[PDB]
Design an enzyme around this catalytic site. Structure first.
Site, PDB file in Angstrom:
ATOM      1  N   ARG A  47       0.835  -1.204   0.000  1.00  0.00           N
ATOM      2  CA  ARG A  47       0.000   0.000   0.000  1.00  0.00           C
ATOM      3  C   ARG A  47       0.864   1.246   0.000  1.00  0.00           C
ATOM      4  O   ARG A  47       0.589   2.219  -0.711  1.00  0.00           O
ATOM      5  CB  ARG A  47      -0.909   0.098   1.213  1.00  0.00           C
ATOM      6  CG  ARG A  47      -2.197   0.859   0.882  1.00  0.00           C
ATOM      7  CD  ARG A  47      -3.091   1.237   2.063  1.00  0.00           C
ATOM      8  NE  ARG A  47      -4.320   1.848   1.507  1.00  0.00           N
ATOM      9  CZ  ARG A  47      -4.919   2.942   1.961  1.00  0.00           C
ATOM     10  NH1 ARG A  47      -4.422   3.558   3.019  1.00  0.00           N
ATOM     11  NH2 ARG A  47      -6.025   3.421   1.352  1.00  0.00           N
ATOM     12  N   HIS A  51       0.744   4.329  -2.559  1.00  0.00           N
ATOM     13  CA  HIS A  51       0.296   5.689  -2.186  1.00  0.00           C
ATOM     14  C   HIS A  51       1.377   6.742  -2.433  1.00  0.00           C
ATOM     15  O   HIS A  51       1.062   7.861  -2.812  1.00  0.00           O
ATOM     16  CB  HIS A  51      -0.181   5.714  -0.736  1.00  0.00           C
ATOM     17  CG  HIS A  51      -1.628   5.363  -0.600  1.00  0.00           C
ATOM     18  ND1 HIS A  51      -2.477   5.962   0.301  1.00  0.00           N
ATOM     19  CD2 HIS A  51      -2.384   4.469  -1.285  1.00  0.00           C
ATOM     20  CE1 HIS A  51      -3.688   5.454   0.174  1.00  0.00           C
ATOM     21  NE2 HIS A  51      -3.658   4.542  -0.778  1.00  0.00           N
ATOM     22  N   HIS A 174      -5.586  -5.983  -4.096  1.00  0.00           N
ATOM     23  CA  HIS A 174      -6.534  -6.127  -3.005  1.00  0.00           C
ATOM     24  C   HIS A 174      -6.817  -7.574  -2.604  1.00  0.00           C
ATOM     25  O   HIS A 174      -7.662  -7.809  -1.754  1.00  0.00           O
ATOM     26  CB  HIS A 174      -7.848  -5.421  -3.308  1.00  0.00           C
ATOM     27  CG  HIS A 174      -7.748  -3.961  -3.114  1.00  0.00           C
ATOM     28  ND1 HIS A 174      -8.721  -3.092  -3.503  1.00  0.00           N
ATOM     29  CD2 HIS A 174      -6.750  -3.213  -2.580  1.00  0.00           C
ATOM     30  CE1 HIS A 174      -8.338  -1.848  -3.217  1.00  0.00           C
ATOM     31  NE2 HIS A 174      -7.150  -1.907  -2.655  1.00  0.00           N
ATOM     32  N   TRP A 190     -10.549  -8.887   1.691  1.00  0.00           N
ATOM     33  CA  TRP A 190     -11.176  -9.185   0.410  1.00  0.00           C
ATOM     34  C   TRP A 190     -11.193 -10.687   0.166  1.00  0.00           C
ATOM     35  O   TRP A 190     -11.758 -11.140  -0.832  1.00  0.00           O
ATOM     36  CB  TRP A 190     -10.403  -8.514  -0.754  1.00  0.00           C
ATOM     37  CG  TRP A 190     -10.543  -7.049  -0.812  1.00  0.00           C
ATOM     38  CD1 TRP A 190     -11.489  -6.321  -1.474  1.00  0.00           C
ATOM     39  CD2 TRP A 190      -9.666  -6.097  -0.182  1.00  0.00           C
ATOM     40  NE1 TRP A 190     -11.255  -4.968  -1.293  1.00  0.00           N
ATOM     41  CE2 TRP A 190     -10.145  -4.805  -0.506  1.00  0.00           C
ATOM     42  CE3 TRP A 190      -8.525  -6.222   0.615  1.00  0.00           C
ATOM     43  CZ2 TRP A 190      -9.531  -3.638  -0.049  1.00  0.00           C
ATOM     44  CZ3 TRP A 190      -7.917  -5.076   1.071  1.00  0.00           C
ATOM     45  CH2 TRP A 190      -8.419  -3.790   0.733  1.00  0.00           C
TER      46      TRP A 190
HETATM   47  C1  HEM Z   1      -9.618   2.443  -6.498  1.00  0.00           C
HETATM   48  C2  HEM Z   1      -8.455   2.622  -6.013  1.00  0.00           C
HETATM   49  C3  HEM Z   1      -8.119   2.057  -4.651  1.00  0.00           C
HETATM   50  C4  HEM Z   1      -8.800   2.242  -3.574  1.00  0.00           C
HETATM   51  C5  HEM Z   1     -10.058   3.035  -3.461  1.00  0.00           C
HETATM   52  C6  HEM Z   1      -8.189   1.629  -2.517  1.00  0.00           C
HETATM   53  C7  HEM Z   1      -8.688   1.695  -1.279  1.00  0.00           C
HETATM   54  C8  HEM Z   1      -8.180   1.019  -0.284  1.00  0.00           C
HETATM   55  C9  HEM Z   1      -8.536   1.045   1.034  1.00  0.00           C
HETATM   56  C10 HEM Z   1      -9.597   1.847   1.688  1.00  0.00           C
HETATM   57  C11 HEM Z   1      -7.792   0.227   1.663  1.00  0.00           C
HETATM   58  C12 HEM Z   1      -7.900  -0.094   3.125  1.00  0.00           C
HETATM   59  C13 HEM Z   1      -7.082   0.737   4.056  1.00  0.00           C
HETATM   60  C14 HEM Z   1      -7.374   0.436   5.464  1.00  0.00           C
HETATM   61  O1  HEM Z   1      -8.241   1.090   5.960  1.00  0.00           O
HETATM   62  O2  HEM Z   1      -6.759  -0.399   6.134  1.00  0.00           O
HETATM   63  C15 HEM Z   1      -6.966  -0.346   0.725  1.00  0.00           C
HETATM   64  C16 HEM Z   1      -6.027  -1.225   0.992  1.00  0.00           C
HETATM   65  C17 HEM Z   1      -5.102  -1.658   0.199  1.00  0.00           C
HETATM   66  N1  HEM Z   1      -4.827  -1.241  -1.040  1.00  0.00           N
HETATM   67 FE1  HEM Z   1      -6.205  -0.238  -2.216  1.00  0.00          FE
HETATM   68  N2  HEM Z   1      -7.100   1.027  -2.959  1.00  0.00           N
HETATM   69  C18 HEM Z   1      -7.023   1.283  -4.272  1.00  0.00           C
HETATM   70  C19 HEM Z   1      -6.083   0.867  -5.098  1.00  0.00           C
HETATM   71  C20 HEM Z   1      -5.067   0.098  -4.730  1.00  0.00           C
HETATM   72  C21 HEM Z   1      -3.997  -0.243  -5.532  1.00  0.00           C
HETATM   73  C22 HEM Z   1      -3.820   0.167  -6.968  1.00  0.00           C
HETATM   74  C23 HEM Z   1      -3.179  -0.967  -4.865  1.00  0.00           C
HETATM   75  C24 HEM Z   1      -1.928  -1.620  -5.435  1.00  0.00           C
HETATM   76  C25 HEM Z   1      -0.755  -1.098  -5.321  1.00  0.00           C
HETATM   77  C26 HEM Z   1      -3.736  -1.087  -3.617  1.00  0.00           C
HETATM   78  C27 HEM Z   1      -3.244  -1.822  -2.666  1.00  0.00           C
HETATM   79  C28 HEM Z   1      -3.792  -1.926  -1.488  1.00  0.00           C
HETATM   80  C29 HEM Z   1      -3.350  -2.795  -0.535  1.00  0.00           C
HETATM   81  C30 HEM Z   1      -2.190  -3.748  -0.569  1.00  0.00           C
HETATM   82  C31 HEM Z   1      -4.201  -2.591   0.630  1.00  0.00           C
HETATM   83  C32 HEM Z   1      -4.080  -3.347   1.928  1.00  0.00           C
HETATM   84  C33 HEM Z   1      -3.359  -2.527   2.955  1.00  0.00           C
HETATM   85  C34 HEM Z   1      -3.469  -3.179   4.268  1.00  0.00           C
HETATM   86  O3  HEM Z   1      -3.855  -4.278   4.244  1.00  0.00           O
HETATM   87  O4  HEM Z   1      -3.174  -2.654   5.289  1.00  0.00           O
HETATM   88  N3  HEM Z   1      -4.876  -0.439  -3.544  1.00  0.00           N
HETATM   89  N4  HEM Z   1      -7.200   0.172  -0.452  1.00  0.00           N
END
Ligand code: HEM
Length: 293
Positions: A47, A51, A174, A190
């Protein structure tokens, strides 16, 4: 008028040096394994790589991974970045051990490292990002909202010069980790294997019985009887006929997903950066398993 950001190899370093950092990160990921209920730091590292790269704007070449500006408070405190402090503190000790590496190269390498150590594809990686001063930090608001539809997703990613296939491949990440109510106002994973990199996100999207519910934070998300969830932006990939074709493709071909993710993710981490012709070729790091460590 657009800035140029040219990659400069941190002085005298070569492949063996960066492989040492990768190994330090990989070893910590394997040891510090209790974080987030034994998910581990893999997903928050991916993430964070995303970001810090995803503030890029193709129009004026501002933001992106180059300057490593997440280290400044404006960006560090972006509400969109809530939770990422855990990934920053995981990396802090690595940076003290290897103070020669730029912040950009460290944040991006941490994402590459985490994907590979979670059994994902090899991601070629290039060094050379240079820390830029505080005045170059991008303003908040450049990262995407989760409560939107496929047209918003498509439009958002055009800013990052990403097309339909690239966007769908990138969202496959995700599979990893989960949402956390206090970070983002969404809660739940997910899928089941959330620290192993697989095409599980596309499978669950197609195969699960999704119900639109409201969570304790008053946001809508899709939930399944298995205990998984999807953001509205995730679920819009099966509502849009162009996205849906690619979701079915990756659901039915693991290898293709891996190859397409690798290409798209590398591009994400390299957007905005000019590499001299005499820059070294991309590095492909060996995993701990391949090194027998
Ligand atoms: C539509 C675009 C995206 C949205 C809206 C989005 C939104 C989110 C949100 C809300 C989380 C959860 C954060 C939390 O509260 O713990 C998340 C997690 C994550 N996102 Fe996305 N994300 C997007 C795109 C991506 C992309 C492109 C990647 C790839 C690099 C990515 C990778 C991740 C990963 C790995 C997590 C997990 C983080 C964790 O588990 O702590 N996301 N995303």
């Amino acid at each position: 008028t657009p800035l140029v950001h040219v990659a400069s190899v941190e002085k005298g370093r070569s492949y063996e040096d960066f492989q040492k950092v990768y190994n330090a990160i990989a070893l910590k990921l394997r040891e510090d394994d209790e974080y987030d209920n034994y998910i581990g730091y893999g997903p928050v590292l991916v993430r964070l790589a995303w970001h810090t790269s995803g503030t890029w704007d193709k129009h004026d070449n501002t933001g992106g991974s180059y300057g490593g500006t997440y280290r400044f408070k404006k960006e560090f405190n972006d509400p969109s970045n809530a939770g990422l402090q855990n990934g920053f503190k995981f990396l802090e000790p690595i940076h003290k051990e290897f103070p020669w590496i730029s912040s950009g190269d460290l944040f991006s390498l941490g994402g590459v490292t985490a994907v590979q150590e979670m059994q994902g594809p090899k991601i070629p990686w290039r060094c050379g990002r240079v820390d830029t001063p505080e005045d170059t930090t991008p303003d908040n608001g450049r990262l995407p909202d989760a409560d939107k539809d496929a047209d918003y997703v498509r439009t958002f990613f055009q800013r990052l010069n990403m097309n339909d296939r690239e966007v769908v491949a990138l969202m496959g990440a995700h599979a990893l980790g989960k949402t956390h109510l206090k970070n983002s106002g969404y809660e739940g994973p997910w899928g089941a294997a959330n620290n192993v990199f697989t095409n599980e996100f596309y499978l669950n999207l197609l195969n699960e019985d999704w119900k639109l519910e409201k969570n304790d934070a008053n946001n809508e998300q899709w939930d399944s009887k298995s205990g998984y969830m999807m953001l509205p932006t995730d679920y819009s990939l099966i509502q849009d006929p162009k996205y849906l074709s690619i979701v079915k493709e990756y659901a039915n071909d693991q290898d293709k997903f891996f190859k397409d993710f690798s290409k798209a993710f590398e591009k994400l981490l390299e957007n905005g950066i000019t590499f001299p012709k005499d820059a070294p070729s991309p590095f492909i790091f060996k995993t701990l398993e391949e090194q027998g460590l």
